[PDB]
Short mmCIF file of C-alpha atoms and ligand atoms in Angstrom, two decimals:
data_model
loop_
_atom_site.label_atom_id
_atom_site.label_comp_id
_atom_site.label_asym_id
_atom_site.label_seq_id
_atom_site.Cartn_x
_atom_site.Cartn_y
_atom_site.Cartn_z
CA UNK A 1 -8.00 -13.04 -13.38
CA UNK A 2 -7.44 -10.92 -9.86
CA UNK A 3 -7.70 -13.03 -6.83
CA UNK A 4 -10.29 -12.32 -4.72
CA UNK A 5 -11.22 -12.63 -1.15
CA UNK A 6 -12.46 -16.38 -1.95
CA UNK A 7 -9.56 -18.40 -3.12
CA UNK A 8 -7.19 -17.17 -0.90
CA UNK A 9 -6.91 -19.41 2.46
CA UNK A 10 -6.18 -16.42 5.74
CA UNK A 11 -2.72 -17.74 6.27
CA UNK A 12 -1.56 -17.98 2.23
CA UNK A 13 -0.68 -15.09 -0.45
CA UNK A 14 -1.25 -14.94 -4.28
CA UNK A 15 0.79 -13.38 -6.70
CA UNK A 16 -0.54 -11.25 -9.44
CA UNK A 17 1.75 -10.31 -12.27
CA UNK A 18 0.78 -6.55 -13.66
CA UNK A 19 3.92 -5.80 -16.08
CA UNK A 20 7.20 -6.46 -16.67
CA UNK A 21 9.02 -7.28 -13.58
CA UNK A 22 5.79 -5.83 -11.16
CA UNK A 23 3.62 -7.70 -9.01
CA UNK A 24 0.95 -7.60 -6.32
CA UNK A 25 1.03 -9.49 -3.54
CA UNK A 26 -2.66 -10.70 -2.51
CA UNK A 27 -3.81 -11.56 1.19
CA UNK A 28 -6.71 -12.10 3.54
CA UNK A 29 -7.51 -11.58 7.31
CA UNK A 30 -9.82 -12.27 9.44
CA UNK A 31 -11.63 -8.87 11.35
CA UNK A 32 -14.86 -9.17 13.42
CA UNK A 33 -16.25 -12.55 11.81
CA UNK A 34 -15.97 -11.11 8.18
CA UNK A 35 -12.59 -11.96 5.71
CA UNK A 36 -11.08 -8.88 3.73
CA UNK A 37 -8.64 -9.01 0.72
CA UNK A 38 -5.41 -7.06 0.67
CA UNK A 39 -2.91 -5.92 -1.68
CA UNK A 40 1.02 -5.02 -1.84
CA UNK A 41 3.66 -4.44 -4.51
CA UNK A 42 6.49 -6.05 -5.73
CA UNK A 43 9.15 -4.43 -7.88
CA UNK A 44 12.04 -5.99 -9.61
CA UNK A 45 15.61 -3.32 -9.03
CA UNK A 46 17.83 -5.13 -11.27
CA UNK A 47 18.25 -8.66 -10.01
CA UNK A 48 16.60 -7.73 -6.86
CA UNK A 49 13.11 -6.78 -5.30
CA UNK A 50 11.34 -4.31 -3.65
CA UNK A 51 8.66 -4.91 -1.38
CA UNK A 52 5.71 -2.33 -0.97
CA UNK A 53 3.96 -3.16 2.33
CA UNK A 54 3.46 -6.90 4.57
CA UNK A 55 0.68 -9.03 4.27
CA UNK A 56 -0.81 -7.95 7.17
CA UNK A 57 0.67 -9.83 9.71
CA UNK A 58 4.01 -11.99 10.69
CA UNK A 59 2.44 -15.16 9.32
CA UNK A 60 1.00 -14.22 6.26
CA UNK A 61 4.40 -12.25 5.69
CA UNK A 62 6.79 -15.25 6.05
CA UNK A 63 4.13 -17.60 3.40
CA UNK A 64 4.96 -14.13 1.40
CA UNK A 65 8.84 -14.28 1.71
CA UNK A 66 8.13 -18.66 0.95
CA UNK A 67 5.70 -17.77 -2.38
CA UNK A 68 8.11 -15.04 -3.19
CA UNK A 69 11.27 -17.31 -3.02
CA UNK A 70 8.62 -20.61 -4.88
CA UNK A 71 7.84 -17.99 -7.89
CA UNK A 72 10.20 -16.03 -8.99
CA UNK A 73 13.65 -16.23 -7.30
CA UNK A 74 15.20 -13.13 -6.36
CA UNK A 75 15.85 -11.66 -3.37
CA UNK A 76 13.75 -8.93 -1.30
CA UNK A 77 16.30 -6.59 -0.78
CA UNK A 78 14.62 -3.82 0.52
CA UNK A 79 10.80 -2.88 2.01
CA UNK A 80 8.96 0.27 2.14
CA UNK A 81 5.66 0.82 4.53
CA UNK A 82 3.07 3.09 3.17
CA UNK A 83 1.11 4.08 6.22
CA UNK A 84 1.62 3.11 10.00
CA UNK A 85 -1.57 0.41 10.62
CA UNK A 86 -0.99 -3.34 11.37
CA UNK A 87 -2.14 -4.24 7.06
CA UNK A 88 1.23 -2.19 6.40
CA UNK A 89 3.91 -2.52 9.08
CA UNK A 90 2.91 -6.47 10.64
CA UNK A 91 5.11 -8.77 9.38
CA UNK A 92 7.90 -6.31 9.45
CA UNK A 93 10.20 -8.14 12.34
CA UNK A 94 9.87 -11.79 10.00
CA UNK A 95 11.34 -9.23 6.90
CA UNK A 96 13.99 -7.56 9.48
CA UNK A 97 14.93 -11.23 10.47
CA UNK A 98 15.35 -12.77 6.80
CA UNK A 99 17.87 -9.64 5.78
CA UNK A 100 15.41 -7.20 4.50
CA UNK A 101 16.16 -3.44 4.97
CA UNK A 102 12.17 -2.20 6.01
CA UNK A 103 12.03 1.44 5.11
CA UNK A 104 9.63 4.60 6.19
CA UNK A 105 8.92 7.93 6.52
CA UNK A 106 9.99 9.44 10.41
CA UNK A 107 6.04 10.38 10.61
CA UNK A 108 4.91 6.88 9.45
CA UNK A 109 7.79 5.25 12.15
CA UNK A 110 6.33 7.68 14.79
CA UNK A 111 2.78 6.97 14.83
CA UNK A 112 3.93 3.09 14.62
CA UNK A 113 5.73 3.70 17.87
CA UNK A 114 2.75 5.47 19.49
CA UNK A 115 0.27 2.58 18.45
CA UNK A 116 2.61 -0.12 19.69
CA UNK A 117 3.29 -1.51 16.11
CA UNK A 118 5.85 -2.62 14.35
CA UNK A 119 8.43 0.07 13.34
CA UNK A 120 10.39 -0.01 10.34
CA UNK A 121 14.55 0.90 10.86
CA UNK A 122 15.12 3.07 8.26
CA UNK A 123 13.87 6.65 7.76
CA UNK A 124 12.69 8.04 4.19
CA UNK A 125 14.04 11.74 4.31
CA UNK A 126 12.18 14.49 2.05
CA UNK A 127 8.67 13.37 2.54
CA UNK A 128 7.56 15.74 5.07
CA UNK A 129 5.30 18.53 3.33
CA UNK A 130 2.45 17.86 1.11
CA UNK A 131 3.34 16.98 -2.69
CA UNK A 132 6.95 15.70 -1.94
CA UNK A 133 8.65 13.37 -4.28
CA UNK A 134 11.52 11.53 -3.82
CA UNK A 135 13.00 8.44 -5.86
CA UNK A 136 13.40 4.98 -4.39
CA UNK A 137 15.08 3.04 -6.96
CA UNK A 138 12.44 1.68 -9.59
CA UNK A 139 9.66 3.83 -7.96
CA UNK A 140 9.08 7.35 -7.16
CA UNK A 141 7.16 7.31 -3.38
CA UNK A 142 4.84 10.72 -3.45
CA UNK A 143 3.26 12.00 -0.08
CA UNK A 144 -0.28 13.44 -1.31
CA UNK A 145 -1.19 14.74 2.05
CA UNK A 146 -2.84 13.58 4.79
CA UNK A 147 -5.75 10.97 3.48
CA UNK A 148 -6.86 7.58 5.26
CA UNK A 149 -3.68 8.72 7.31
CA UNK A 150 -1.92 11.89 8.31
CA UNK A 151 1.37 9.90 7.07
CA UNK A 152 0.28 7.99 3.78
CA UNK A 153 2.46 7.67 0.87
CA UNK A 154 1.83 6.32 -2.61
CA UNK A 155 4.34 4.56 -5.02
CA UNK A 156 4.26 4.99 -8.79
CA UNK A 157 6.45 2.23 -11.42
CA UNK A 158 7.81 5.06 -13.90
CA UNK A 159 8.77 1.95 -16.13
CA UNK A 160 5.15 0.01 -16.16
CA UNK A 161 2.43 3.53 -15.28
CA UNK A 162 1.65 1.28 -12.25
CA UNK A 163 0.21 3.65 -9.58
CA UNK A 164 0.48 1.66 -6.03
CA UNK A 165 -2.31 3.80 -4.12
CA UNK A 166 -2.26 1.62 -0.86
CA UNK A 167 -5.31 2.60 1.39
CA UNK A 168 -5.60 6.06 0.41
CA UNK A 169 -7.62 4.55 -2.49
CA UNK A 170 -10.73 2.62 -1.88
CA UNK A 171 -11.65 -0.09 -5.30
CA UNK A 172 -15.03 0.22 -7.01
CA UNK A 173 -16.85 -2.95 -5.07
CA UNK A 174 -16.51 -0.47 -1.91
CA UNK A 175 -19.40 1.92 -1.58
CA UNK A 176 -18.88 3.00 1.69
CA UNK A 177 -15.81 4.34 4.04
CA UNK A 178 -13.68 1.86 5.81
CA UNK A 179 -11.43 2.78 8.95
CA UNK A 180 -10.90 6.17 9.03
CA UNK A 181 -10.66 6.77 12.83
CA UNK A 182 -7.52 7.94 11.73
CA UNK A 183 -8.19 10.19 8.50
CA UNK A 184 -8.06 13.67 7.49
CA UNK A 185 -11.63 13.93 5.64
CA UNK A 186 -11.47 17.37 5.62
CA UNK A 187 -8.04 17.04 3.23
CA UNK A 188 -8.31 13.36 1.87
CA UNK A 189 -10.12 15.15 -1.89
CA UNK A 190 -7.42 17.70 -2.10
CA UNK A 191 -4.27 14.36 -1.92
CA UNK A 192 -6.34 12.34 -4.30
CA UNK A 193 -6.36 15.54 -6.54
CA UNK A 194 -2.46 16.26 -6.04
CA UNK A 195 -2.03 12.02 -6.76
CA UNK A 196 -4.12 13.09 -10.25
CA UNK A 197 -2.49 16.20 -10.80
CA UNK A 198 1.05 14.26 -10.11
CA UNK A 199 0.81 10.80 -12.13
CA UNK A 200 -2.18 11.56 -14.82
CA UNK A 201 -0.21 8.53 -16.93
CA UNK A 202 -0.86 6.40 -14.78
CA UNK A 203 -2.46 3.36 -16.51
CA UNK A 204 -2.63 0.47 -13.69
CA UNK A 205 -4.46 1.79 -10.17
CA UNK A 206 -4.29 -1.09 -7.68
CA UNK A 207 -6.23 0.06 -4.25
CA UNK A 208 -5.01 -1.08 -0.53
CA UNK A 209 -7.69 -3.40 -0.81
CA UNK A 210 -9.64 -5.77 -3.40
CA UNK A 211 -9.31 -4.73 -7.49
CA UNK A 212 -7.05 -3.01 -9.54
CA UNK A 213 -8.24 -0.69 -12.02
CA UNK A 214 -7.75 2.97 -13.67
CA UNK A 215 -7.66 6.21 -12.63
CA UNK A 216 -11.30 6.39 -12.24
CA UNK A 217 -10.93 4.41 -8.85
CA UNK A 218 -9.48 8.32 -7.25
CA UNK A 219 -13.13 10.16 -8.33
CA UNK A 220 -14.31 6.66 -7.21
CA UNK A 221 -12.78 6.94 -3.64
CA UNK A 222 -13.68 11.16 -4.00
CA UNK A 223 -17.70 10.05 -4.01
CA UNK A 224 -17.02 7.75 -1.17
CA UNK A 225 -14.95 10.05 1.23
CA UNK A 226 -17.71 13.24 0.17
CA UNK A 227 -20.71 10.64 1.11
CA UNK A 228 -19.44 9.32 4.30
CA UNK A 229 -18.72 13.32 5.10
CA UNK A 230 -22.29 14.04 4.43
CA UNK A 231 -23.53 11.24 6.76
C1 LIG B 301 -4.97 -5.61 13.20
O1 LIG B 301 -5.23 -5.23 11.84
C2 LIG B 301 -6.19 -4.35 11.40
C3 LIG B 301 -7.54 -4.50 11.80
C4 LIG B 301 -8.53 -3.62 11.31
C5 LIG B 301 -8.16 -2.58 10.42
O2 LIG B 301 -9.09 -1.67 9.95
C6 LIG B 301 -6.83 -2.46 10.03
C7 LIG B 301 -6.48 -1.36 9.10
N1 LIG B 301 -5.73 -0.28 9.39
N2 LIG B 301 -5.63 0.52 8.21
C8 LIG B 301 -6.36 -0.12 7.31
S1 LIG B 301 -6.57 0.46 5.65
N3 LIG B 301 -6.87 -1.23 7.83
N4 LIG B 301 -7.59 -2.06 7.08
C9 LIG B 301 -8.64 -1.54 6.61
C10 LIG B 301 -9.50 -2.20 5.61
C11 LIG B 301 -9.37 -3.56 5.33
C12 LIG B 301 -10.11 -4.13 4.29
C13 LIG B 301 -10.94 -3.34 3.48
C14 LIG B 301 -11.01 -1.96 3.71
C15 LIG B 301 -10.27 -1.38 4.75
C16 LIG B 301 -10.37 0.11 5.00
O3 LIG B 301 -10.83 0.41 6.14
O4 LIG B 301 -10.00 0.96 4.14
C17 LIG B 301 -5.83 -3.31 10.52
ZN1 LIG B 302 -4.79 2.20 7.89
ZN1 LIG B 303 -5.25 -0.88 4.43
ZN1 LIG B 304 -17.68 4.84 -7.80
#
């Protein structure tokens, strides 16, 4: 049972897990009057964990550090940023403070320095051009191309077929765009196609935002970019 935007207090985070040692991390904010769900990864690296994005914001991310330490015990060791917005990098000076090593690409730590935001230390090298791989211990991180952001990445679990898509992939309850002040429309259906073309094993599809599902959630977020183009 996924938690949803309901029984999750802004302020406290859920776990949720998907596999053998792989998690999401489940949030909520407040934005305009409205409350919105979000989602980041957790990946065991031997006796060890890997974070995949904050929970969107410095409070939420220390009660994710707390749940992380109540539930299962191990230490985050290292913490990779997917894209440059406040959902991804807030809450990385509370993992800098506790020990964590907060990783991203130069573009992603860039456009975080140009927006204000909070920039992770450490640089990703070899994610640059379109369709770049490289591995990051129990993940491979993949750069599509530019989507919701000129600088979004996606992680895929080779062990579990988990495909993290962060906010390059809408879920199925969303029938219209979000925030894409910062998007490449024009190229955001040719990096969902190179994230098909790249991980068509992929069994588990968990979105930035709201549920998980298969691989039908990239033609799913294909309709929605193509509609809101069409506007
Ligand atoms: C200060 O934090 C904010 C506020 C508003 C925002 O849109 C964001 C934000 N930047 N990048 C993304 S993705 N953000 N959240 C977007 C969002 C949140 C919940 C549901 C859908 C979306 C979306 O626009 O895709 C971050
Ligand atoms: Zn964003
Ligand atoms: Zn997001
Ligand atoms: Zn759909």
């Amino acid at each position: 049972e996924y938690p949803t935007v309901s029984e999750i207090p802004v302020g406290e985070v859920r776990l949720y897990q998907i596999a053998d040692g792989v998690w999401s991390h489940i949030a909520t904010q407040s934005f305009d009057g409205a409350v919105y769900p979000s989602n980041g990864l957790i990946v065991r690296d031997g006796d060890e964990l890997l974070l995949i994005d904050t929970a969107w914001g410095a409070k939420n991310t220390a009660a994710l550090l707390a749940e992380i330490e109540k539930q299962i015990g191990l230490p985050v060791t290292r913490a990779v940023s997917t894209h440059f917005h406040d959902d991804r990098v807030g809450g990385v000076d509370v993992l800098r403070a506790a020990g964590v090593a907060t990783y991203a690409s130069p573009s992603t730590r860039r456009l975080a320095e140009v927006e204000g935001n909070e920039i992770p230390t450490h640089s990703l090298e070899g994610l640059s051009s379109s369709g770049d791989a490289v591995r990051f211990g129990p993940v491979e991180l993949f750069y599509p191309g530019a989507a919701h952001s000129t600088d979004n990445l996606v992680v895929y679990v080779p062990s579990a077929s988990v495909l993290y898509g962060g906010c390059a992939i809408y879920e199925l309850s969303r029938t219209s765009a979000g925030n894409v002040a910062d998007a490449d429309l024009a190229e955001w259906p040719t990096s969902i196609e190179r994230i098909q073309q790249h991980y068509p094993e992929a069994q588990f599809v968990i979105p930035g935002h709201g549920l998980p599902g298969g691989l039908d959630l990239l033609k799913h977020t294909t309709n929605v970019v193509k509609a809101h183009t069409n506007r």
